[PDB]
Design a binder for these strands. Structure first.
Ligand SMILES: [Mg+2]
Length: 1002
RNA sequence: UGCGGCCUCUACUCUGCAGUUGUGGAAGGUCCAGUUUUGAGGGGCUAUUACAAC
RNA sequence: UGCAGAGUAGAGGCCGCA
């Protein structure tokens, strides 16, 4: 078999990127080894899989972890492993599949790495009909070809390509006989490669595709651009972009190294502006492919970026804005600062929660001595000596369940509140002063913008102090219908139990009703499950029915729960014994069950459950009170609330739940005073409405234009009632005005929809009752309607959130850079903005910490839209070693980007210099030709040795050549002192020049 | 070779759920509707945030 | 990470028709 001509003609590029490919693979395998505490197919992680399929599994938990992460870091492995299963019958992918795919991929990658990085070696593996070809290479070519079929299908989903745009590939890959691979196709992944046996091998394009599975997207683009693989399509063609996208769609995801940026007022401003240019995710799903495409932008460094919001970062951004701005004197937000682990066999975790400004808390979290706060306990990064320790995590705000928790300090400039640790075991936390809904944060921001943060803060603190005064009075039993108004809290902001208590209507929930209802519901479900079966459930239910004693200390604990859920005469005994050991105050029915298999056990469990619940129902029907179940009459839920007891729980035990519409009255009073707001009826004006009116009437602004684009919703499809030829519902894209009108007419339109839809269901014989169909449609319309309504409500919220970020960011930058804003407007903001604030040029400075060092990257002038460049540079593996060479931790952004592009151009030229050196050595010394012919491994290292001994090179020169060559293979810079260098951006160029000169002979 | 129906398998996207006990439904989630394109309001349901103890 | 539903795309088997 001959090496493909593409490979032979582009050897320097295949050489470079094959090396990069194999290093990237090792990196992933190494990472998995570390995290899971245990010739790349002999790697510990790969050995594990090899043995996992064959022998009895000693840790299935580890096997399954390895298989899950391998598929995370190598996304193509999902497709190839699924094809390997089918190839082989079991339903699911097994360690053998994963092992076989990767053994072959690695084997062929290694082969081509060796051929392309060596002037001459005699490769036995290329001999026609050999073991390597028959067992590894030829199977892989077929696998790769089948992989690509699916990759092209994924292109439709990922980038919204249509059949017409992919047909230039999809229609021409295979040729029909009676089916066959069209080896004449320009992008054919298989060829005969002059094999006399006439078996399909990987083609050159095939080898390029294999390599690109193991590259980053940036390097896929650099690599493929140097190959003539695009027939006649030109640099700017859509076809070229399709080809390149197809070669990256499922490529390696590398584990990313830790970065910690220093934040500032300016940085937070810029984080907010770069957030508002992105599409909200709830909006993006509703948009046509055309308009979704408008968020796919090309960066400065010619990289495609999807400008879409991962998540709603409005609230954290606002908290950073307040902290770094030092805008609240007394309020501090709830931060987590890691976890305490102690050994006490299980390990127990406790979160290290506290309150302070994110910066100040972070300064306290990690001492110079590497201990936490004032604790003494080591921050790490079955041995009792290793415990206790604290998991290393950067201070972040706690934001769960749509809440923001706070602590109110009496005095200004208070220190961070970190938890005390006791007995190296207990983390003594603080109940937050109060808790606010994340939905309240827009109005707070608006209040802050209109009045100032200090006035905003005074209002939060005053509201908090009113609730406290109320709860104190409850504890003295001094709250009446007569005096409730004096506490200054509106009825709609008081708990219902207080309102019940003052009205003389205090009651618990009715236990008897609840038990009667629960028993009936559960009996019905039991029969549903019995029927479904004849036609973690069990672990949850077994514990549900386990009686509690001694504050619940008797019930099944975490580890034993996991074992129970996961869990021949002896085998039967063993299974029964488990429930004896778990002491199942007994489970009410389980003992009746006691068999041969899980399936028998589930059936018997359900029958016995049915008999138990029937008994209970029958006793309820006799009017009897029963008590056996998991409902517990002594819980306060079921008792009447008392003023004094509830007063104490509200004051001492819980945070104050702050009300919604805290800031409304003050916002409205302000706006009423402005003459621009003269028209507005403030009796029908919510804060979402008023934000929009403010920016249109006071600021001559409007929301981003992408909130006006047409949107798709299934429910609106159903209401529009338009069908294709075959009779499927059409996907409409409506305007808001259209949907307003459909919604008004939803009753009529739903009637029509159901009539037609029912008729279409009846066509199928499998489904044949009438009421069966009515239920199917009921659920169809409810679910769809609910999805639509929620989506539209949330998008409206994103609009005003963006208004607020824009306003705050603009305020920061106006005062800071001394730039000329005032003219800038949210309506101008767009993902690729060519005008307005995002296009303004400003000096910038980005400071970050990586691998225990602290660096700064500057710009004397930079468009605000490009602020994301800094993270791309900081993330780069080379940044560390490069700045070691520069001899400064402070550097220009432009210089580093130029350096990195020049490095990228030098790397293949290094490969070429090596090649020509090896060639010289082979031409001079004929001993090596013999060593090749008798199949002996010659390396660069070997050639250097011959050059050294026969006095062509000296040790110094040998060491330099070796070290530079190694640095480039690593995709990194060499250590300081190896070679004399120039300044940025010519460091890589100067290293290349040295290598070139040290590779000339004596 | 084209078209229609039925069955099986695979992929992608979107929505819902996950130690024990206690406390808490002014908040959050969800459901209903002659409600909202103004996270506003009404009615039902529900321990989700947190903290203590194991 | 395990489980359920809906929409979309693709492949295989069977039948009828041109
Ligand atoms: Mg309200």
């Amino acid at each position: 078999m001959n090496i493909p001509a593409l490979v032979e003609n582009q050897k320097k590029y295949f050489g470079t990127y094959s090396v990069m490919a194999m290093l990237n693979a090792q990196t992933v395998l190494d990472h998995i080894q570390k995290v899971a505490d245990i010739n790349l197919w002999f790697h510990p992680v790969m050995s594990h899989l090899y043995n996992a399929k064959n022998g009895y599994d000693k840790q299935p938990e580890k096997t399954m972890f390895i298989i899950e992460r391998l598929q995370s870091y190598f996304p193509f492995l999902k497709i190839m492993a699924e094809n390997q299963r089918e190839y082989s019958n079991r339903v699911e992918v097994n360690s053998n599949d994963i092992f076989e795919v990767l053994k072959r991929a690695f084997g062929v990658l290694k082969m081509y790495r060796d051929l392309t990085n060596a002037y001459k070696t005699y490769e036995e593996k290329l001999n026609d009909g050999c073991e390597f070809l028959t067992s590894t290479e030829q199977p892989l070519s077929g696998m790769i070809n089948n992989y690509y079929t699916v990759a092209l299908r994924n292109m439709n989903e990922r980038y919204g390509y249509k059949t017409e745009d992919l047909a230039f590939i999809q229609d021409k890959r295979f040729k029909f006989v009676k089916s066959q691979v069209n080896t004449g196709f320009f992008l054919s992944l298989q060829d005969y490669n002059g094999d006399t046996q006439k078996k399909l091998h990987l083609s050159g394009v095939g080898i390029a595709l294999l390599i690109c599975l193991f590259l980053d997207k940036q390097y896929i683009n650099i690599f493929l651009s140097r190959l003539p693989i695009f027939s006649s399509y030109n640099a700017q063609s859509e076809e070229r972009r399709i080809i390149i996208r197809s070669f990256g769609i499922n490529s390696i995801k590398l584990p990313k190294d830790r970065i910690h940026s220093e934040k500032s007022n300016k940085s937070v401003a810029m984080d907010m502006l770069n957030e508002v240019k992105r599409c909200p995710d709830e909006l993006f799903t509703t948009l046509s492919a055309e308009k979704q495409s408008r968020f796919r932008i090309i960066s400065d460094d010619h990289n495609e970026v999807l400008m879409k919001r991962s998540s709603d970062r409005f609230v954290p951004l606002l908290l950073q804005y307040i902290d770094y701005g030092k805008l609240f004197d007394h309020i501090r937000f709830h931060v987590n600062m890691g976890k305490l682990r102690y050994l006490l066999v299980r390990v127990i975790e406790q979160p290290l929660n506290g309150f302070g400004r994110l910066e100040e808390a972070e300064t306290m979290r990690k001492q110079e001595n590497g201990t936490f706060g004032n604790s003494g306990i080591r921050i790490r990064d079955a041995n009792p000596a290793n415990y206790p320790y604290i998991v290393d995590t950067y201070t972040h705000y706690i934001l769960e369940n749509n809440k923001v928790e706070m602590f109110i300090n009496d005095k200004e400039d208070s220190a961070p509140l970190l938890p005390v640790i006791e007995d190296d075991r207990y983390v003594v936390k603080t109940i937050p002063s109060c808790r606010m809904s994340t939905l309240e944060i827009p109005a707070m921001a608006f209040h802050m913008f209109l009045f100032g943060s200090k006035k905003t803060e005074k209002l939060i603190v005053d509201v908090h102090n009113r609730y406290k005064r109320l709860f104190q009075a409850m504890q003295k039993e001094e709250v009446t219908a007569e005096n409730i108004a004096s506490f200054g809290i509106a009825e709609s902001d008081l708990p219902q139990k207080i309102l019940d208590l003052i009205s003389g209507n205090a009651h618990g929930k009715d236990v008897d009703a609840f038990i009667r209802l629960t028993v009936d519901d559960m009996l019905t479900d039991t029969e549903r499950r019995i029927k479904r079966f004849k036609d973690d459930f069990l672990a949850k239910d077994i514990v549900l029915f386990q009686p509690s004693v001694n504050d619940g200390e008797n019930k099944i604990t975490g580890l034993n729960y996991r074992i129970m859920q996961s869990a021949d005469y002896e085998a039967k005994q063993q299974f029964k014994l488990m429930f004896e050991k778990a002491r199942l105050e007994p489970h009410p029915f389980l003992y009746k069950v006691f068999p041969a298999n899980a399936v028998e056990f589930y059936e018997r469990y359900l029958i016995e459950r049915k008999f138990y619940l029937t008994g209970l129902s029958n006793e309820i029907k006799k009017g009897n009170r029963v008590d056996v179940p998991f409902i517990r009459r002594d819980q306060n839920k079921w008792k009447t609330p008392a003023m004094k007891t509830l007063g104490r729980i509200y004051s001492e035990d819980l945070p104050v739940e702050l009300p919604r519409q805290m800031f409304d009255n003050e916002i409205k009073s302000h706006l009423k005073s402005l003459p621009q707001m003269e028209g507005i009826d403030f009796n029908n004006a919510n804060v979402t409405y008023l934000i929009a009116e403010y920016m249109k009437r006071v600021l001559d602004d409007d929301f981003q234009t992408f909130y006006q684009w047409n949107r798709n919703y299934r429910y609106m499809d159903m209401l529009k009632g338009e069908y294709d030829r075959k009779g499927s519902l059409q996907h409409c894209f409506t305007s808001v005005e259209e949907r307003e009108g459909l919604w008004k007419e939803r009753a009529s339109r739903t009637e029509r929809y159901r009539k037609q839809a029912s008729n279409k269901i009846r066509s199928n014989r499998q489904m044949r009752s009438s009421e069966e169909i009515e239920t199917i449609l009921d659920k169809r319309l409810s679910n769809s309607r609910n999805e639509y309504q929620k989506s539209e409500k949330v998008i409206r919220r994103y609009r005003v959130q963006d208004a607020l970020l824009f306003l705050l960011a603009k305020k920061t930058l106006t005062e800071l850079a001394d730039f000329d804003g005032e003219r800038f407007k949210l309506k101008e903001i767009m993902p690729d903005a060519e005008k307005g604030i995002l296009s303004e040029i400003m000096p910038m400075s980005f400071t970050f910490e990586k691998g225990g060092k602290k660096y700064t990257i500057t710009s004397e002038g930079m468009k605000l839209k490009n602020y994301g460049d800094f993270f791309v540079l900081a993330s780069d593996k080379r940044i560390g070693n490069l700045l070691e060479l520069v001899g400064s931790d402070i550097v220009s952004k432009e210089d580093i980007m130029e350096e990195f592009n020049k490095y990228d151009q030098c790397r293949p030229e290094i490969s070429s210099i090596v090649f020509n050196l090896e060639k010289w050595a082979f031409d001079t010394y004929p001993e090596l030709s013999a060593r090749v012919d008798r199949e002996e491994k010659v390396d660069f290292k070997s050639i250097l040795k011959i050059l050294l001994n026969n006095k062509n090179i000296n040790k110094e020169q040998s060491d330099i050549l070796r070290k530079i060559r190694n640095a480039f293979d690593a995709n990194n810079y060499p250590d300081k002192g190896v070679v004399e260098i120039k300044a940025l951006p010519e460091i890589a160029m100067s290293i290349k020049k040295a290598f070139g000169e040290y590779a000339i002979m004596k």
